[PDB]
Symmetry: D2
Subunit: 362 residues, 4 copies
């Protein structure tokens, strides 16, 4: 049974807590033991440790990583703390489940990538949109030749949370803006579908410059939206965007792969639907709405009946299981810190391209 | 902490187990203790006890309901076992979380309802489609006057799990040990939603059909005795009209519990295959007039306990976590759970009334 | 060239004018001669005859039907005038394109049906929702065996043009001079579609409601006599089941004629608000299993006459050009026009039987 | 009444013929006189003149354009003939309704633009997707401040009419004789819509591909010389960002001209495959918050001329009736026709500028 440390209890902290709690319920084997939860202040950590089922809560994150009963550390803190916490966890001999993006800079991710190799421990980064049954089904369909050769990718990730204060808005805590917060997710899906990125040309904007209800000066330090044209190492084209100010959208990570023999389209706001076009007889020709069910990777561990909608949080249960199987030497987790470094190079290259008005080659 | 016993480990058993496991994570308080898991054969129970995180497994459900470390019993076994297991649990002084429908007949349900009344323990029935944030938001919107007075309800629940005529016959397709067909599997869920939106059913007029009448049975065929599909017109106690259907042979549908409430000042529409969307129409200025797509997020009941970010789709299994919490709070004396065995008996009467109406070609009043 | 008379210039009158104008553009042959347009008052008739391309306008419908240069008469006037105008046109030896419903009563429709048989002239009724490429494709798909045998129909027709309670009372809301309500305006259309997919209706059980019972009337108010909404359970002659509804007070809906046919081997579903989409489910291998969205294009009946490329949305008004062509062909002695007054009389019996069932609380058998 | 000449009878020729027939039916006034139809061969012209309701057919387009009974000429021929036919019509003193794109090159379009300005006759180009009630309603909503200030545009135009590699070659797929590929066929439409919503384009950075490089040609094989798809990042004169694409090989799409304008106070979204729907988000109370589906009806520009009841779907062909009416009004001096040949030349510059950017790997400024 894997011993678990959890650092942070917010959006992702609670998501990881629920995932670790049910990974064996869904996939079998032994239930992970919830050992230590870290958060500030201490009374909050004690409270959440009690309700989450952790053996203790502490205000000292170092206390979580150094617990001998811990085998794996979930890190769900602001981006500015990822590098320090992940390097400490790896040095401590712990496997690491790190939230995206890796850190603030390419240099940070490079140091982390080197630390991971030196430690001989497993790493996985929290790119949970790669875990839906629909997404995994799409990957397999492409590999099987269902849409022929990919000839164009178009992807977006729109939300509007910033169009209504967060550490996400600072360079010391968040790093990049929309690119770092949402863009990296789109990259994780995009490269899994299309292969590695060879070239980007990008542009960006900040639409809301100051948080109007903060009272004191509250300068937004990073971008609200960005777009890029892509060339993949295959030579194929892509379109790419992200935004945290696109009003009306809440989790609109949407993508499509146009192939020579068909098209696949997906929208995370309806994460249980995968749209597949393949040529057919004229009288019955059109896109198929594939509703998520037990034929798709991972779904049958949660439900034997199709159409009982798989949830956002259940992607994290799948993610936990992939890390669990990697730790046992039964599969390879993706992306590890090496695969993740490439993703960081992409989003940071997009940022560079937007700043300079020049294409960036990889 | 609440001591939990779980009977069965299938579709609903595993769903209940996931719910009990995460209920305090989502909603606070103390994590329930997973004491005893019951299933057959013994090896299976031992294995699933280990992976589900229950202190022990047993092949003897009676031991499970009798354990002094157990306070509440989740009953997820087949319909023909509900009555026996629930009456035993209640007689052992345990609260009960019972899967739908209550049993095979109204008479069984009445008998269980009588047992529950004399028990002074809390009961809840597994009508999980009433727990989605979208459904709960819709109920609140109607109470707040968002659509004015309801003037018509239209609901359906289509699935195709029995559509293939080569699927083998079973005792579940007999009236005796299977009870109702589509009305029992799906109809009861639609009633649970419908009465929550519209109030009590006063009258039904129904029709029903067995579409695939004979199915393969070791070498030859055997007759299917209960209905593949049913439809009904409704009058509510308010006088308001309704349409109602269910089907287990409706090809292409997987979990299409879909409903609509039309009112004097607007319309609400929902489809469970897209459980994170609620469609609301209210009159607006001509230039911007039209239905709104309300995407599930923390403004809707229960959602914020699972995720702070709107549009991160709430799942089918998370409905069961909400249901666990409602029972948990009822056990603590901090709110009534719905539907209890009394509320559930009325639902049983409605579905069996529809079957009676369909057999007679006559309306049935309640 | 066919000589055309047109009576009325409103919603359908202008629709018919546009149809007759482009029917040969789309389908070939000789453009019909637009000879006489009748409307009132006379100034409107003269102005519209000029802009519609008619040789002359008149305020006297009887003059239009008797003109020796006329072969066919479009009748798009209010329901109370249908019987008289159709009988006069037929007596004058003209073919008739009559707007739905046939008349205000079954009695009137029976007289019209006898008159049409007595004349040796073609008749067609304006059930234009049967003319879409999507609908005609659906019929052909079922005729190819695409969904096996139909086992259930579910149809609705929702609109909200009377939902506003301050809309004034009129004689159209009385039984005597208005006939049916929502069943007469909308229900007849749903029946036309329904029987085209499922065959003849054997029995109905219906309910109905006047939701807005009183409306402004010259300073005070007056009572609405006919129904704002109705619903019915259908038993088809084939033995199969159906659900049916209509409403003129269903807020947010504008032309929601929506139907589905569930079959033994698939399902077809359609919504007129998206008239260029037809949803087809057929069983498929599990990896790719699901409904197909069929977007209207040249593979569907009639579409290629208007556009060679798919996805260029076919319009509501182009249904009428198709309807005109079906009549032209029937007059020429090629195709048959459906529904003629005999086919139409049956539709009238069904909708009036629904109204009777709702009033009496009893099923009505055909 | 306006006298009409029609050149060509294909996809657009028949569409124009249907539009001219019903323009007065929808909008009033005098029905145009359908005088001369030109098409080849002569038998076909005579046959279609009859069924389309034109007084006569000819195989000599030059004769049709100089007929003194003709006031306006619809030109629906292939792109390589537009320049010659439009210049001759204008020189004969006729108004012109020209199909898109203008011609093969920017130089051709500059020639046509000069000819129109010299003729003092009205011109309109067939950008019919700017005529839908939904699109026109969207422009009005933006002008009224319904979504605040635009902060982003994302538009696409996907179809699959060339996605099948077995579909035969044509001279359309050469540079010399067909011009641009998807940019010319579809991109121009997307630009017409885009600039109407966002204003003029200041900069493009683009890329393009030929996906099917060869096609069957009467027993042999021939190379496809123009692009099957293209994408571009845009900066508008406003400073606002844009994404743009087109494709003739995007499998499963038939007329997927789809766009959205994201603003400071809301979002508008549209897809031509459901041309009767306009999606509008404006901030609302959290309990009811979300995009509205606005179904096309008489509150939207032009719809009421075709139908008095909402939700009776307006069709593709009816866009062309609206286009005809705009040209009639312009000819009568009671309205502006957009885009005329001057407006059209800007559209040509954008699409050819995208083509240039894709070839050079460098951004192209227009300012
Ligand atoms: N994969 C995905 O879908 C998502 C990923 N994320 C990522 O997860 C991470 C966390 O984001 P949220 O949960 O949204 O942030 P949050 O603000 O909701 O939570 C941050 C947590 O870290 C805790 N914390 C901060 N400093 C700490 C310290 N020194 N020691 C211990 N605990 C500390 C906070 O008290 C809080 O519990 C970020 O890296 C973010 O990019 C966030 C949301 C979704
Ligand atoms: N609320 C919902 O959405 C759903 C509810 N259900 C309900 O779940 C229940 C189970 O459904 P079935 O299809 O019958 O499932 P099933 O045939 O899989 O049986 C359920 C479980 O009961 C166990 N079991 C059977 N006999 C037992 C015994 N004597 N002692 C202990 N365990 C025993 C089985 O091994 C299995 O683990 C039914 O009441 C059904 O209506 C089912 C699916 C969804
Ligand atoms: N098939 C379809 O989709 C539709 C059918 N209809 C049908 O169209 C018909 C007309 O609809 P209403 O609402 O009554 O429209 P309405 O009240 O606009 O009248 C229709 C036309 O008849 C003219 N008219 C009335 N009395 C006349 C007379 N004595 N002589 C000559 N012209 C006369 C009117 O001026 C008007 O142009 C009805 O039968 C109705 O059911 C209406 C809308 C859609
Ligand atoms: N606005 C829009 O949505 C659309 C515009 N178009 C445009 O319409 C134009 C034509 O395309 P289609 O209609 O698809 O082409 P098509 O090839 O279907 O039709 C060409 C027409 O021109 C005729 N023609 C050719 N040479 C001629 C000559 N020398 N004299 C007289 N007639 C001649 C042909 O016989 C045929 O009638 C192109 O410019 C194209 O870009 C095409 C489709 C849609
Ligand atoms: O209660 C249920 O019964 C199953 C049929 O046994 C259906 O598949 C479920 O979707 C439904 O919730
Ligand atoms: O026949 C009809 O009647 C009108 C109501 O009078 C509706 O608005 C139309 O949609 C319908 O086709
Ligand atoms: O201008 C157009 O070109 C055609 C291709 O030539 C497309 O099929 C049409 O949808 C488009 O409007």
């Amino acid at each position: 049974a894997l011993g678990v440390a959890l650092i942070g209890t917010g959006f992702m902290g609670k998501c990881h807590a629920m995932a670790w709690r049910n990974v064996a319920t869904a996939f079998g084997g032994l239930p992970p033991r919830l050992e230590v939860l870290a958060d500030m202040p201490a009374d909050k950590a004690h409270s959440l440790a009690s309700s989450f089922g952790f053996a203790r809560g502490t205000a000292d994150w170092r206390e979580a990583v150094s617990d001998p009963a811990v085998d794996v550390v979930s890190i769900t803190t602001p981006n500015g703390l990822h590098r320090e916490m992940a390097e400490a966890a790896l040095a401590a001999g712990k496997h690491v489940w790190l939230e995206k993006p890796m850190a603030l800079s390419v240099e940070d991710a490079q140091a982390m990538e080197a630390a991971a190799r030196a430690s001989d421990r497993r790493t996985i980064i929290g790119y949970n949109y790669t875990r839906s049954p629909a997404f995994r089904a799409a990957v397999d369909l492409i590999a099987e030749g269902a849409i022929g050769r990919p000839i164009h990718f178009r992807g977006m990730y729109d939300e509007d949370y910033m169009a209504d204060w967060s550490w996400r808005l600072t360079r010391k805590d968040g790093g990049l803006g929309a690119l770092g917060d949402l863009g990296c997710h789109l990259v994780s899906v995009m490269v899994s579908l299309m292969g590695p990125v060879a070239r980007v040309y990008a542009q960006a904007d900040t639409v809301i410059t100051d948080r109007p209800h903060q009272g004191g000066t509250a300068r937004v330090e990073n971008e609200d939206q960005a777009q890029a044209l892509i060339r993949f190492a295959s030579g194929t084209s892509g379109e790419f965007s992200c935004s945290r100010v696109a009003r009306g959208y809440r989790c609109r990570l949407a993508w499509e792969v146009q192939g020579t023999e068909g098209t696949l389209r997906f929208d995370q706001e309806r994460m249980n639907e995968l749209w597949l076009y393949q040529p057919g007889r004229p009288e019955i020709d059109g896109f198929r709405r594939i509703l998520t069910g037990p034929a798709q990777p991972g779904f049958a561990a949660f439900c034997p009946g199709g159409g009982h909608n798989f949830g956002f949080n259940e992607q994290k249960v799948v993610e936990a299981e992939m890390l669990r199987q990697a730790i046992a030497g039964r599969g390879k987790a993706w992306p590890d810190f090496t695969d993740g470094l490439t993703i960081e190079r992409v989003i940071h290259g997009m940022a560079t391209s937007a700043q300079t008005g020049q294409p960036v080659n990889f």
